[PDB]
Amino acid sequence: MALSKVKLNDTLNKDQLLSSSKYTIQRSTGDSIDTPNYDVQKHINKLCGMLLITEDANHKFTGLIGMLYAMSRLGREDTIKILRDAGYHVKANGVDVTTHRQDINGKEMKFEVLTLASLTTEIQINIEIESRKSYKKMLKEMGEVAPEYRHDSPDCGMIILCIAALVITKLAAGDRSGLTAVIRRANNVLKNEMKRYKGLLPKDIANSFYEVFEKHPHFIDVFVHFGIAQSSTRGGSRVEGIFAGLFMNAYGAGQVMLRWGVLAKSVKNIMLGHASVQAEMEQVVEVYEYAQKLGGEAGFYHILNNPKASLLSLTQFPHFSSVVLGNAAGLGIMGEYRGTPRNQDLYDAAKAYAEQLKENGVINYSVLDLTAEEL
Amino acid sequence: MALSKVKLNDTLNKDQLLSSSKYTIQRSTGDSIDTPNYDVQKHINKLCGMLLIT
Amino acid sequence: MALSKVKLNDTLNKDQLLSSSKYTIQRSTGDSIDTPNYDVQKHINKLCGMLLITEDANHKFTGLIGMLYAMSRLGREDTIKILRDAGYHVKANGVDVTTHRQDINGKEMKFEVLTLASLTTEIQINIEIESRKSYKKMLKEMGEVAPEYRHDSPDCGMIILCIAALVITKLAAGDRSGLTAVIRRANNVLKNEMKRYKGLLPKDIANSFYEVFEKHPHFIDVFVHFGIAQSSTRGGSRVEGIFAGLFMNAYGAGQVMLRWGVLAKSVKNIMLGHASVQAEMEQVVEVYEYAQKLGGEAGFYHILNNPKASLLSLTQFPHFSSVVLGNAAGLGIMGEYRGTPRNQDLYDAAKAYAEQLKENGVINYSVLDLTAEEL
RNA sequence: CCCCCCCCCCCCCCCCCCCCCCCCCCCCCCCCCCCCCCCCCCCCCCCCCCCCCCCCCCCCCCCCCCCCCC
């Protein structure tokens, strides 16, 4: 009645404030950005392949090249549009294919290159030279190169962007610490591809992507939205199916704590009954309902650095955090998770009860009814 | 009442995200694709038969 | 029935009055104000860096320069618009980049400067000279300067505005008394940045900002709204994520008393039952509901000096104030808080009961039900 | 007057899938009887009868409000 009516909604208040700014900032990204159009797309995918067939390839530029493929999928107009939507001033840089004439080994040669701010028509021909070497050597070994082994395969563009997706997976912690998790998965999920391409080195590309995301942080946006627009797709090659599968493992990065909450609720961990956890409840519901109201776009809040993401934190509730993290310890899902309970006693109690829960599965007969049962 | 109300819909959330992309990709299939019209149809069916009697 | 129907709503009445003025005041801010546009933004961020690489830099002008960065983000038109919305007459001052020619050390040199009312093209070149010194010295020490160490890093603008945000955090008390709290946090939260920049002195900038807010109090508005518009953002660098995180710690400054109320309610502190606290209840609900109705924009009322902020005070209720402040004492969250209970007996009673509450966590089983439990 | 505390967040694991299988099959038109309907008696009506009728203006006292604290 009298005091139980006094409360303050802070989580939703804060959203409401950020949501309703009457003014906007705009960032100046850099001097140029290349916006490759649909028409260059095949050529980029071709350049991607060249790196994949090259054994022990230099993967310095693979991060950046991948982003170029993603942008040539989105297309010149759509790509600019997502940059302006994120808020950055864009010096758009049109991308044309031109032929270059240079004497490699004395003899003069032609090359297919792109006019790129970010990539010298030098370091380009160098990938094409290096590829040809790993290719004539490949031709010698098997006699004739199969289509799945060449740089033509329509998958090459997407294959590269696969480990890119995996990078997004672990970009939650902010540092390079995912890298060993990234290689580990790339090996099981992508093992088939690694067999067709000697240049598919997980460690090296994953680093080249981490590199391009840390350095140019606006790309992380572009990629996330490309990834969405590619997952919106109606059909596609098994590799685009893999891409989307992985990309979607990254929905909800940083909010692990949240799902583990739903879990603690689902298993009916007893430590949720505790008085000092019951005290937080009112607010913890606020936030869960906030996540609900936010919907889909919410999962990617931690990966892009969307300010509003702080709001989803369950950290602000130490007692609940502790029983939820405990529950997830006792069920053996946490670790090597570097989260720390703020309440050691509760964590221990919840871990304890949770370990006991997996022991005894009691059958519940009031979920499904039957008018005659002999047993 | 209190905890049994806390949940997160993830399956439907995810759909809702993919469904509502504001941008789109477009793939470059190959150099050509043949799009035979209605008017060639009988001839194609004929070519099909040829393989079936052989 | 008869007397229990007589009441007067004063809190909501007062709001309703202020909300519905039919006339308006307009203040004359000063002779000029510079409104840098989007197009100068990179240059300002560059000038910011110069101060951050300079070891033992003079941070007198850093307060004002920070505000210039924020205003070049908002953009010339948006910035003016928020000034007129706050109500101040604006002598808008357009900002152009021009080259200056001056002989430093005998030899003649070029400089990139801005035409600024608030900043002499003298004191500008002086930051650029000082930076170059700390830079060639830096070049000597490590041989080659990494990108995270230069004045180019896109973060420099925002990094500076970070301690600015922290200043807003503690601007609740009105005086310089936050300053030691400001340095303390800047050191843990920003420790990584302080490693990349020898010119990131928390004490010195924080003072330079306090300075520019006390002196030109209209900027405090501009900054708050920039801060909102930057937190509205969709994505961003880890540093813009930090910025927003801190900025939002300042939502609800001055209304600490209010949240501690919700707390006293949440823990069911017994002293809320007391007769003389029950007597205030009717009004205390009025105010809590007022805060609810006000919503998001309400949190920043104390930081800007929004008159309407007096209304949120729980001071006008001594008995409730005292049990709420007591509760927060007994739970060890207050201190070194300089709030005084107006009722010593109630404060002591509530502190007492509150200390006893953390002792015994009694498990409540009627929140979650189960059709069969053996234990 | 009001205000005055502490405080970024974040950190795990992980694609997915994989079986079997066309369908269908019976029987069979429907209907068929009886039978127009109706038929009586019967205008309606009728009396008595204007309404109204008293008394009556109304009003009349005392009184500005307000004052603390913050």
PDB file of C-alpha atoms in Angstrom, chain A residues 1-10 13-32 81-83 85-89 174 215 217 221 225 268-276 278-283 301 303-308 310-311 353 356 360 362-364 366, chain C residues 38 41-42 70 72-75 78 81-82 85 147 154 225-238 240-242 244-245 247-249 251 255 258-259 261-262 265-267 272 278 281 284-285 288-289 291-292 294-297 300 320 360-365 367-372 374-375:
ATOM      1  CA  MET A   1       0.000   0.000   0.000  1.00  0.00           C
ATOM      2  CA  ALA A   2       2.068   3.009   1.364  1.00  0.00           C
ATOM      3  CA  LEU A   3       5.904   2.420   0.935  1.00  0.00           C
ATOM      4  CA  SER A   4       5.691  -0.606  -1.399  1.00  0.00           C
ATOM      5  CA  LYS A   5       4.397   1.797  -4.032  1.00  0.00           C
ATOM      6  CA  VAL A   6       7.588   4.001  -3.910  1.00  0.00           C
ATOM      7  CA  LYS A   7      10.186   2.943  -6.456  1.00  0.00           C
ATOM      8  CA  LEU A   8      12.266   4.505  -9.175  1.00  0.00           C
ATOM      9  CA  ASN A   9      12.763   2.969 -12.577  1.00  0.00           C
ATOM     10  CA  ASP A  10      16.327   3.768 -13.496  1.00  0.00           C
ATOM     11  CA  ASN A  13      14.557   5.932 -17.486  1.00  0.00           C
ATOM     12  CA  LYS A  14      18.118   5.914 -18.742  1.00  0.00           C
ATOM     13  CA  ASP A  15      17.176   4.237 -22.029  1.00  0.00           C
ATOM     14  CA  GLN A  16      14.387   6.684 -22.487  1.00  0.00           C
ATOM     15  CA  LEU A  17      16.926   9.539 -22.090  1.00  0.00           C
ATOM     16  CA  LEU A  18      19.456   8.201 -24.596  1.00  0.00           C
ATOM     17  CA  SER A  19      16.691   7.236 -27.014  1.00  0.00           C
ATOM     18  CA  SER A  20      15.301  10.737 -27.084  1.00  0.00           C
ATOM     19  CA  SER A  21      18.314  12.997 -27.618  1.00  0.00           C
ATOM     20  CA  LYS A  22      17.317  16.011 -29.705  1.00  0.00           C
ATOM     21  CA  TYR A  23      20.865  16.452 -31.069  1.00  0.00           C
ATOM     22  CA  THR A  24      23.562  14.250 -32.627  1.00  0.00           C
ATOM     23  CA  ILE A  25      27.315  13.876 -32.915  1.00  0.00           C
ATOM     24  CA  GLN A  26      29.190  12.997 -36.120  1.00  0.00           C
ATOM     25  CA  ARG A  27      32.694  11.524 -36.278  1.00  0.00           C
ATOM     26  CA  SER A  28      35.396  12.128 -38.903  1.00  0.00           C
ATOM     27  CA  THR A  29      36.635   8.579 -39.686  1.00  0.00           C
ATOM     28  CA  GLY A  30      39.842   9.183 -41.634  1.00  0.00           C
ATOM     29  CA  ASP A  31      40.842  10.780 -44.917  1.00  0.00           C
ATOM     30  CA  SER A  32      39.421   8.132 -47.276  1.00  0.00           C
ATOM     31  CA  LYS A  81      24.143   4.360 -45.920  1.00  0.00           C
ATOM     32  CA  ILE A  82      25.174   2.193 -42.919  1.00  0.00           C
ATOM     33  CA  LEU A  83      28.160   4.465 -42.266  1.00  0.00           C
ATOM     34  CA  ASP A  85      23.522   5.725 -39.977  1.00  0.00           C
ATOM     35  CA  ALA A  86      26.279   4.958 -37.495  1.00  0.00           C
ATOM     36  CA  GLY A  87      27.118   8.673 -37.777  1.00  0.00           C
ATOM     37  CA  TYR A  88      30.542   8.943 -39.424  1.00  0.00           C
ATOM     38  CA  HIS A  89      31.406  11.537 -42.126  1.00  0.00           C
ATOM     39  CA  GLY A 174      37.896  -6.522 -26.065  1.00  0.00           C
ATOM     40  CA  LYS A 215      42.534  -0.034 -35.729  1.00  0.00           C
ATOM     41  CA  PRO A 217      36.583   0.565 -35.229  1.00  0.00           C
ATOM     42  CA  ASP A 221      29.856  -1.800 -37.405  1.00  0.00           C
ATOM     43  CA  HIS A 225      25.397  -5.144 -40.476  1.00  0.00           C
ATOM     44  CA  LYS A 268      14.861 -23.494  -9.552  1.00  0.00           C
ATOM     45  CA  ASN A 269      18.161 -23.008  -7.693  1.00  0.00           C
ATOM     46  CA  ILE A 270      17.156 -22.458  -4.048  1.00  0.00           C
ATOM     47  CA  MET A 271      19.559 -19.580  -3.355  1.00  0.00           C
ATOM     48  CA  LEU A 272      17.196 -17.311  -5.311  1.00  0.00           C
ATOM     49  CA  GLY A 273      14.867 -17.462  -2.300  1.00  0.00           C
ATOM     50  CA  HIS A 274      17.441 -15.842   0.006  1.00  0.00           C
ATOM     51  CA  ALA A 275      16.355 -12.548   1.586  1.00  0.00           C
ATOM     52  CA  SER A 276      19.239 -10.385   0.252  1.00  0.00           C
ATOM     53  CA  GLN A 278      14.887 -11.109  -2.974  1.00  0.00           C
ATOM     54  CA  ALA A 279      15.758  -7.466  -2.174  1.00  0.00           C
ATOM     55  CA  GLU A 280      17.390  -6.917  -5.552  1.00  0.00           C
ATOM     56  CA  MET A 281      14.611  -8.738  -7.446  1.00  0.00           C
ATOM     57  CA  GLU A 282      12.508  -5.643  -8.144  1.00  0.00           C
ATOM     58  CA  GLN A 283      15.354  -4.095 -10.154  1.00  0.00           C
ATOM     59  CA  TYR A 301      25.179  -4.172 -28.216  1.00  0.00           C
ATOM     60  CA  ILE A 303      30.107  -6.227 -29.888  1.00  0.00           C
ATOM     61  CA  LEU A 304      29.605  -2.779 -31.413  1.00  0.00           C
ATOM     62  CA  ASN A 305      30.393  -0.464 -28.496  1.00  0.00           C
ATOM     63  CA  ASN A 306      26.830   0.700 -27.962  1.00  0.00           C
ATOM     64  CA  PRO A 307      26.793   2.778 -24.773  1.00  0.00           C
ATOM     65  CA  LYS A 308      23.311   1.528 -23.893  1.00  0.00           C
ATOM     66  CA  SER A 310      26.162  -0.900 -19.770  1.00  0.00           C
ATOM     67  CA  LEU A 311      22.476  -1.066 -18.893  1.00  0.00           C
ATOM     68  CA  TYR A 353      22.949 -26.808  -4.238  1.00  0.00           C
ATOM     69  CA  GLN A 356      23.374 -31.724  -5.941  1.00  0.00           C
ATOM     70  CA  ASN A 360      18.572 -36.704  -8.689  1.00  0.00           C
ATOM     71  CA  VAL A 362      12.647 -36.612  -9.959  1.00  0.00           C
ATOM     72  CA  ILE A 363       9.829 -37.322 -12.501  1.00  0.00           C
ATOM     73  CA  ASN A 364       6.933 -34.794 -12.516  1.00  0.00           C
ATOM     74  CA  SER A 366       1.303 -33.261 -13.312  1.00  0.00           C
TER      75      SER A 366
ATOM     76  CA  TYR C  38      31.917  19.188 -38.194  1.00  0.00           C
ATOM     77  CA  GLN C  41      36.531  18.364 -35.796  1.00  0.00           C
ATOM     78  CA  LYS C  42      39.599  16.367 -36.811  1.00  0.00           C
ATOM     79  CA  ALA C  70      32.256  18.386 -27.925  1.00  0.00           C
ATOM     80  CA  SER C  72      32.524  20.244 -33.144  1.00  0.00           C
ATOM     81  CA  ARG C  73      30.847  16.864 -32.650  1.00  0.00           C
ATOM     82  CA  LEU C  74      27.398  18.338 -32.109  1.00  0.00           C
ATOM     83  CA  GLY C  75      28.113  20.493 -35.154  1.00  0.00           C
ATOM     84  CA  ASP C  78      22.981  21.511 -33.506  1.00  0.00           C
ATOM     85  CA  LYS C  81      20.107  24.966 -31.359  1.00  0.00           C
ATOM     86  CA  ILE C  82      20.825  23.590 -27.844  1.00  0.00           C
ATOM     87  CA  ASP C  85      16.778  25.839 -26.287  1.00  0.00           C
ATOM     88  CA  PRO C 147      50.028   4.802 -33.493  1.00  0.00           C
ATOM     89  CA  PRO C 154      41.017   9.152 -33.053  1.00  0.00           C
ATOM     90  CA  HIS C 225      23.474  17.321 -24.165  1.00  0.00           C
ATOM     91  CA  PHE C 226      26.546  16.388 -26.156  1.00  0.00           C
ATOM     92  CA  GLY C 227      26.967  13.570 -23.638  1.00  0.00           C
ATOM     93  CA  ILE C 228      23.372  12.481 -24.267  1.00  0.00           C
ATOM     94  CA  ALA C 229      23.749  12.673 -28.077  1.00  0.00           C
ATOM     95  CA  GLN C 230      26.991  10.667 -27.852  1.00  0.00           C
ATOM     96  CA  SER C 231      25.325   8.035 -25.694  1.00  0.00           C
ATOM     97  CA  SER C 232      22.480   7.807 -28.217  1.00  0.00           C
ATOM     98  CA  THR C 233      25.101   6.474 -30.654  1.00  0.00           C
ATOM     99  CA  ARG C 234      24.722   3.025 -32.214  1.00  0.00           C
ATOM    100  CA  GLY C 235      28.350   1.761 -31.960  1.00  0.00           C
ATOM    101  CA  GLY C 236      31.857   3.036 -31.248  1.00  0.00           C
ATOM    102  CA  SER C 237      35.462   2.661 -30.057  1.00  0.00           C
ATOM    103  CA  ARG C 238      36.119   1.183 -26.600  1.00  0.00           C
ATOM    104  CA  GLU C 240      33.542   6.099 -26.532  1.00  0.00           C
ATOM    105  CA  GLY C 241      32.112   3.158 -24.646  1.00  0.00           C
ATOM    106  CA  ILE C 242      34.061   4.191 -21.579  1.00  0.00           C
ATOM    107  CA  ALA C 244      29.286   6.842 -22.076  1.00  0.00           C
ATOM    108  CA  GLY C 245      29.687   4.436 -19.158  1.00  0.00           C
ATOM    109  CA  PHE C 247      28.815   9.919 -18.239  1.00  0.00           C
ATOM    110  CA  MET C 248      25.885   7.681 -17.151  1.00  0.00           C
ATOM    111  CA  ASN C 249      27.269   7.243 -13.626  1.00  0.00           C
ATOM    112  CA  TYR C 251      22.579  10.238 -14.132  1.00  0.00           C
ATOM    113  CA  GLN C 255      19.199  12.358  -5.788  1.00  0.00           C
ATOM    114  CA  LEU C 258      16.087   8.927  -3.400  1.00  0.00           C
ATOM    115  CA  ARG C 259      17.650   5.596  -4.406  1.00  0.00           C
ATOM    116  CA  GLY C 261      14.839   5.256  -0.115  1.00  0.00           C
ATOM    117  CA  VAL C 262      13.948   2.547  -2.654  1.00  0.00           C
ATOM    118  CA  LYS C 265      11.815  -0.192   1.098  1.00  0.00           C
ATOM    119  CA  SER C 266      13.526  -3.149  -0.608  1.00  0.00           C
ATOM    120  CA  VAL C 267      15.214  -4.437   2.548  1.00  0.00           C
ATOM    121  CA  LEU C 272       9.433   2.660   8.081  1.00  0.00           C
ATOM    122  CA  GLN C 278       3.853   6.906   8.376  1.00  0.00           C
ATOM    123  CA  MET C 281       4.194   8.833   3.701  1.00  0.00           C
ATOM    124  CA  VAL C 284       6.742  11.085   0.086  1.00  0.00           C
ATOM    125  CA  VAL C 285       4.753   9.047  -2.427  1.00  0.00           C
ATOM    126  CA  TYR C 288       8.437   9.506  -5.851  1.00  0.00           C
ATOM    127  CA  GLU C 289       5.586   9.544  -8.367  1.00  0.00           C
ATOM    128  CA  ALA C 291      10.178  11.548 -10.277  1.00  0.00           C
ATOM    129  CA  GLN C 292       8.493   8.691 -12.130  1.00  0.00           C
ATOM    130  CA  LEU C 294       9.455  13.200 -15.008  1.00  0.00           C
ATOM    131  CA  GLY C 295      11.351  10.251 -16.392  1.00  0.00           C
ATOM    132  CA  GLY C 296      14.756  10.264 -18.028  1.00  0.00           C
ATOM    133  CA  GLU C 297      15.479  13.987 -18.237  1.00  0.00           C
ATOM    134  CA  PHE C 300      20.336  15.438 -14.927  1.00  0.00           C
ATOM    135  CA  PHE C 320      11.709   9.539   6.515  1.00  0.00           C
ATOM    136  CA  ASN C 360      20.711 -13.510   8.922  1.00  0.00           C
ATOM    137  CA  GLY C 361      19.633 -14.481   5.412  1.00  0.00           C
ATOM    138  CA  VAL C 362      16.356 -16.360   5.817  1.00  0.00           C
ATOM    139  CA  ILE C 363      15.349 -18.369   2.678  1.00  0.00           C
ATOM    140  CA  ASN C 364      11.855 -17.605   1.270  1.00  0.00           C
ATOM    141  CA  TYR C 365      10.217 -20.606  -0.459  1.00  0.00           C
ATOM    142  CA  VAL C 367       8.517 -17.143  -4.509  1.00  0.00           C
ATOM    143  CA  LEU C 368       9.179 -20.365  -6.497  1.00  0.00           C
ATOM    144  CA  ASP C 369       6.773 -23.352  -6.220  1.00  0.00           C
ATOM    145  CA  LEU C 370       7.425 -27.065  -6.906  1.00  0.00           C
ATOM    146  CA  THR C 371       4.743 -29.858  -6.872  1.00  0.00           C
ATOM    147  CA  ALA C 372       7.096 -32.458  -5.244  1.00  0.00           C
ATOM    148  CA  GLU C 374      11.570 -34.301  -0.650  1.00  0.00           C
ATOM    149  CA  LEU C 375      13.697 -31.799   1.331  1.00  0.00           C
TER     150      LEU C 375
END
